Design a protein around this ligand. Sequence first.
Ligand SMILES: Nc1ncnc2c1ncn2[C@@H]1O[C@H](COP(=O)(O)OP(=O)(O)O)[C@@H](O)[C@H]1O
Ligand SMILES: [Mg+2]
Ligand SMILES: [Mg+2]
Ligand code: NA
Lengths: 6, 357, 20
Amino acid sequence: TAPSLS
Amino acid sequence: QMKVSRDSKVTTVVATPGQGPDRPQEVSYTDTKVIGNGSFGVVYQAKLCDSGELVAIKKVLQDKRFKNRELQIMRKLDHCNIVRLRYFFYSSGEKKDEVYLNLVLDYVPETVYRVARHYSRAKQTLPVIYVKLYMYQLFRSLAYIHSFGICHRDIKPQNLLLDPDTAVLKLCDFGSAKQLVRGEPNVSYICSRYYRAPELIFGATDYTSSIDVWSAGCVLAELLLGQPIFPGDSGVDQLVEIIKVLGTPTREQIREMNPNYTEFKFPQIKAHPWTKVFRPRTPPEAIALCSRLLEYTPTARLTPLEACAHSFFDELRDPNVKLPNGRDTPALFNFTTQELSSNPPLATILIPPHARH
Amino acid sequence: LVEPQKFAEELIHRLEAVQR
Ligand SMILES: Nc1ncnc2c1ncn2[C@@H]1O[C@H](COP(=O)(O)OP(=O)(O)O)[C@@H](O)[C@H]1O
Ligand SMILES: [Mg+2]
Ligand SMILES: [Mg+2]
Ligand code: NA
């Protein structure tokens, strides 16, 4: 669980 | 910025209010202590000097390697089942030179998780009236964020704040949320274990808001069972647990989740009937609701608004319903045009006749 | 991510063991 690469 | 003074240590910052246009004001607070912790957040409690009100201050590192949507999503949210963002500000923090965002939220004392853990330690079942009230308010917050195209992507009992005196539930923790755009791909290993939809476990990058509905179905089932329904350290472990309940997905259901798995020959496991999954005294309406939420095909899951209209929540629409402590229920029927936009004719069910006042 | 071949092989092996 973690958000997307920029 | 920041500054210290005496009243107890007083901290003063210039903070931007969560709503309206950007017009920062001086904000003072005292009585700081560390209260909660997540995988990303470090939450302080504090007491606002002006009003005396308790607030929580989530201080998160602003990692420029990742997409930090949390502030931009929270600022547009105003709903009674979403924790309110009162103010935010930036501070220097502890990592030498680094950028820390501070979110000043309404303080809420409990979570669905901690409440459910009390009943498991005591070998009791959470009374069904609370399962109804907590699940209903969760779906109502989902109907609100989904009407803006926003997917939370971390729905789980630790992310559901409770004021257990009023039985008001507030969704929190938007640090994984995203405005899902069809045609643009999404990072796949999102959500926490036990609550990941099967399309995510299969690595789909083209999923929709209905992953939140699968997660809500896991919360409901957990509340009814007293433990998570799909535990497991890895993706295969959890998918085995899902398959031991729902049966092996058909080829067409696999295609709806991730077409890259349609040509493998998975062994065909018979489904376990929902009435045997749960305890023998479980209400049939909760089982029917759970079976329309925990569906392989994502388009076959209830939308959140449709879930609120479900017969399981019929007791909440009684005029004579009261909480066990004697207080009346929270506000449940003040739906706006925004959160009804999914399907406006459900107002015939969702606002019962005694609440049109 | 994970290679679909390797994930499905593992899942198939697990599903064969619990298959009643
Ligand atoms: N508004 C709040 N009031 C009280 N406690 C909170 C509040 N927001 C978060 N917490 C506590 O801190 C924990 C972590 O906060 P959260 O926003 O979920 O951060 P993370 O993204 O690290 O999970 C929550 O599960 C909750 O128990
Ligand atoms: Mg959390
Ligand atoms: Mg988070
Ligand atoms: Na309770």
